[PDB]
Design a protein around this ligand. Sequence first.
Ligand SMILES: [Mg+2]
Ligand SMILES: [Mg+2]
Ligand SMILES: [Mg+2]
Ligand SMILES: [Mg+2]
Ligand SMILES: [Mg+2]
Ligand SMILES: [Mg+2]
Ligand SMILES: [Mg+2]
Ligand SMILES: [Mg+2]
Ligand SMILES: [Mg+2]
Ligand SMILES: [Mg+2]
Ligand SMILES: [Mg+2]
Ligand SMILES: [Mg+2]
Ligand SMILES: [Mg+2]
Ligand SMILES: [Mg+2]
Ligand SMILES: [Mg+2]
Ligand SMILES: [Mg+2]
Ligand SMILES: [Mg+2]
Ligand SMILES: [Mg+2]
Ligand SMILES: [Mg+2]
Ligand SMILES: [Mg+2]
Ligand SMILES: [Mg+2]
Ligand SMILES: [Mg+2]
Ligand SMILES: [Mg+2]
Ligand SMILES: [Mg+2]
Ligand SMILES: [Mg+2]
Ligand SMILES: [Mg+2]
Ligand SMILES: [Mg+2]
Ligand SMILES: [Mg+2]
Ligand SMILES: [Mg+2]
Ligand SMILES: [Mg+2]
Ligand SMILES: [Mg+2]
Ligand SMILES: [Mg+2]
Lengths: 157, 236, 115
Amino acid sequence: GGLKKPKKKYLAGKPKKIWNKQLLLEELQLMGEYGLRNKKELWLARARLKWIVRRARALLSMTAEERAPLEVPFKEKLYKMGFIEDPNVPLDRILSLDVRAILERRLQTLVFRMGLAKSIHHARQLVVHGHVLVAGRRVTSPGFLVPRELEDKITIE
Amino acid sequence: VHLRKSLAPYWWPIPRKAGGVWAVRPSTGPHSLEYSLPLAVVVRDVLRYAKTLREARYIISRGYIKVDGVVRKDYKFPIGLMDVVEIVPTGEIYRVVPDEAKYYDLKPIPSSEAALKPLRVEGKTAVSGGRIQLHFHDGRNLILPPDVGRQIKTFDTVVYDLENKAIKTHLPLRLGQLAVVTHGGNIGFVGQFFEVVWTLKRRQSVVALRKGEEVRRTILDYIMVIGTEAPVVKIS
Amino acid sequence: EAQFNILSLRENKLLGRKEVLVEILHRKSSTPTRQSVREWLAKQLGVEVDKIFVRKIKTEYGIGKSKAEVHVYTDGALARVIEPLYILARNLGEEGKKLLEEARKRRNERREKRR
RNA sequence: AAACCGGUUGAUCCUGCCGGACCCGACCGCUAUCGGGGUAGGGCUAAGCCAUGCGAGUCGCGCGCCCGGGGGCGCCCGGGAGCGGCGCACGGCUCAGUAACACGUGCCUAACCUAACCUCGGGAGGGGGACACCCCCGGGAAACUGGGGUCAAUCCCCCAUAGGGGAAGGGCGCUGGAAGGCCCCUUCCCCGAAAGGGCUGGCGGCCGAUCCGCCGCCAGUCGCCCGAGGGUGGGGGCACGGCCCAUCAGGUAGUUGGCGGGUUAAAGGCCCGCCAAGCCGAAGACGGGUAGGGGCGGUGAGAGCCGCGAGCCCCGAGAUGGGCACUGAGACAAGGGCCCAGGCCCUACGGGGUGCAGCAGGCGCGAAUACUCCGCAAUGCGGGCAACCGCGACGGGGCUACCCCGAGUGCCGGGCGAAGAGCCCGGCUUUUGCCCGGUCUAAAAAGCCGGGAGAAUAAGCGGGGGGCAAGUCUGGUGUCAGCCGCCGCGGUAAUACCAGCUCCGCGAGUGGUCGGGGUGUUUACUGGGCUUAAAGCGCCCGUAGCCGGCCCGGCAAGUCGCUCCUGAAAUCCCCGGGCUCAA
Ligand SMILES: [Mg+2]
Ligand SMILES: [Mg+2]
Ligand SMILES: [Mg+2]
Ligand SMILES: [Mg+2]
Ligand SMILES: [Mg+2]
Ligand SMILES: [Mg+2]
Ligand SMILES: [Mg+2]
Ligand SMILES: [Mg+2]
Ligand SMILES: [Mg+2]
Ligand SMILES: [Mg+2]
Ligand SMILES: [Mg+2]
Ligand SMILES: [Mg+2]
Ligand SMILES: [Mg+2]
Ligand SMILES: [Mg+2]
Ligand SMILES: [Mg+2]
Ligand SMILES: [Mg+2]
Ligand SMILES: [Mg+2]
Ligand SMILES: [Mg+2]
Ligand SMILES: [Mg+2]
Ligand SMILES: [Mg+2]
Ligand SMILES: [Mg+2]
Ligand SMILES: [Mg+2]
Ligand SMILES: [Mg+2]
Ligand SMILES: [Mg+2]
Ligand SMILES: [Mg+2]
Ligand SMILES: [Mg+2]
Ligand SMILES: [Mg+2]
Ligand SMILES: [Mg+2]
Ligand SMILES: [Mg+2]
Ligand SMILES: [Mg+2]
Ligand SMILES: [Mg+2]
Ligand SMILES: [Mg+2]
């Protein structure tokens, strides 16, 4: 008798104890470097990071036969998004993946890391006002997680 | 009578969520609701000739579509296994055949085998005059004299002439023929009949098919004999 | 400005039309007028403008690019019985407006009678 | 992230509760710019009462009549009131009854019916009638309704034959696992079809402009009757599965079964005549309480717990309470009927209507709630040869802090300011807000594309003694007022109250009270404890239950492995793709 409704997708990266000093210090650093809007964006990055790690955890627990069809395609898909660097690492190497690798794929970060803007908050403003063309199309969402192949197509107006 | 989109058969080539809350309901024709597709769905989805339901009804209303030699002007007419669908103004012919992916597919066929339909004998009844009536997998019937109808047992496949209302060729169900699975998980598979575990109910007998050397098993109910090493009519 | 090219063309003998697909490429420019698309297609296919109907012009996000779905009919009489009234009212100029308008007067009729 | 932290002591180790931190659901407070996706909204409250409107029609290719325009061959077209066919038993709403063959899964009907539709075989001959619209009159407040005349049918009826039912005897034969079945034969009794109708074209004949038809035939097409099967819908049956209470222990008497009958479409104590004493129960009857069942949903790392098991889908039941029937394939019928009960409404007092658990809407209750809006374009359905018509189903938007997703409320440099806020200066951009055009849309709206001015139009909520991030800064009060989930403060120097300044958390949100889960190994299967903290019956005999020595042989029930038919869709996990990414 229950009707399904959507739930928050950033809950997996949300800490259940927000009032930790060292926790507040580390997260405040991350928002500063990458110019995020609120902690929801930061938690949304971690929720992606938990997916990549929890999926890799389960694939380790799967049998060798079961792991085989999914092992290489999983690493290859991670490589193409730009999270990882080698798509041929051991599967346990993905377990130590760090949340900054997901934050670098944000479209706002790439505009700043490509020297296309003065500051990271300026690069967010560039995407917001619609001066950043991704393969010729205006992509105005600064939190866009650009994959590897699309990265070289980023231009300004 | 309505048909909610949720209650539509799973294998139908329509989106499950996106669309209206309704689906076109077949009008009790020569098939089963679970194993038939209405004519308006075929004209709109499988052939893509109509973009709306009114356009599909318009195409059907002109008699452009022929199903087994009879022009069907009903947009809720059911189509099913081994049916011959012919589009008059374009001249294309299809035979709805068991498919490994779509579960039921419109395959083009040559014009020669368009009047032929392979029918599986579902049973026989004794009618007045002492004659025998044959019931086929799509509910079609054929009355025969008693001696000729004695030698056609159930599950035998007969190639039926829609043009002459006759039996071209009778294919008995014996071990060693070519069979196609017409229902169940193993649909679309064509292979040799080489193994049977005869149960107390013959319709529930376990049968095995081989294609060198992928072996699939089903029940005896779910396989149609299509002949010896050469299939009699194009199905794949 | 306005780059037009026939992206695809499907020949439909049942409805007596060729459902054509057009690719409109208008960088830094407004969405093309539906009349302008019909003029190009009629000049392109060599047919009269009355036989060509623009169904929908859909414009992509973030760039001046559009895709239009068009029906070109062999004979005008059958076209006015197959295409919906609002498509004719969008495309035929004034006559479809009357056809829509004359439809409405027959709709108030049979509704006061149902009263 | 498989997590702990506060508090019983002078101090300590425990036990054990209560609190904090998190997610979701309802209601509420303060605040509130934009967009996208979504099956969010009087459910958790009275199945309480209702003004008003809209909510099932369609067919002239079944039928006659009337009217208007046109034309001569035999009519064309438009319209009207009707008869007639089919549909209105689908669709929409709600959750009282129900602890039950209601629901779920897996099987049956060899004990059954089914209009529309599909296939095979066969048939369509003879003869009659009535009633509407209409015309001449009405009656009545209205509802409704009377008499005479008169034209038809795919309207109704008769006759024939086919066919059908029963009883009885026989059989090679069929189906099927198995014949009280089908088929064939014989005897009798009994019931008992049809619309060759419409259209199109061709032929011929009768007839006449006061007719615009009628007749015979042929073909095409849409139809009608019978037999068989299928299909669909439905009636019925079975095995098993899913709440609490013993401060509820005996219950049942058509009750349990048998035989013979009636009724039914069909089996049955369904009902009836006779015969017996059986049937259920501590493996929990009976009684009470609660509840529509499922798909499923929330929460947790999981086992599990809970139902927010409201919204979407499937089944069920209901239409103010309780009953009973007509028609029909199907109802004992939400916008049909009749009766009782209980209301209300109009009335000319003689009558006649009505019950919104339909879509809007009003009153009422309550902590708590939307427009008396637009369209049949999409998805479907009924009707039609078709065209097309209709549809508060459905689609569209409005309102609403409904759920999820993406953003803004500026960016760069400089000075003052504190490295903050803020102020000012110089340069930049226009997401967004505003105006306009194209596109979109049934039409609007929003979206999208493009153009103009412009920093210009846009931040709150809760907190700073510990838990727990944030002030031993200042003013005021002085165990008063106030705070406080717990611990605990305040009685003159208050980091806890009221204020200023300042800082902290989250941010178009943030809080308060509730409910569920975690918390919690405080329900313990995983996985607790019982000497003394709560907890071994004062002791023993034993029924059900649970648990039980060794070896050999058999079966294969459990169990294990493979495969098949299944376990609706949606929901869930993984992978690919398409909306700008996202949802
Ligand atoms: Mg735990
Ligand atoms: Mg103490
Ligand atoms: Mg507690
Ligand atoms: Mg209510
Ligand atoms: Mg007709
Ligand atoms: Mg009329
Ligand atoms: Mg009628
Ligand atoms: Mg219903
Ligand atoms: Mg009379
Ligand atoms: Mg009749
Ligand atoms: Mg019989
Ligand atoms: Mg008779
Ligand atoms: Mg007659
Ligand atoms: Mg009986
Ligand atoms: Mg009884
Ligand atoms: Mg609702
Ligand atoms: Mg009642
Ligand atoms: Mg009633
Ligand atoms: Mg009521
Ligand atoms: Mg419609
Ligand atoms: Mg948001
Ligand atoms: Mg300074
Ligand atoms: Mg607009
Ligand atoms: Mg404040
Ligand atoms: Mg203070
Ligand atoms: Mg602290
Ligand atoms: Mg405090
Ligand atoms: Mg304990
Ligand atoms: Mg003792
Ligand atoms: Mg005691
Ligand atoms: Mg004992
Ligand atoms: Mg076993």
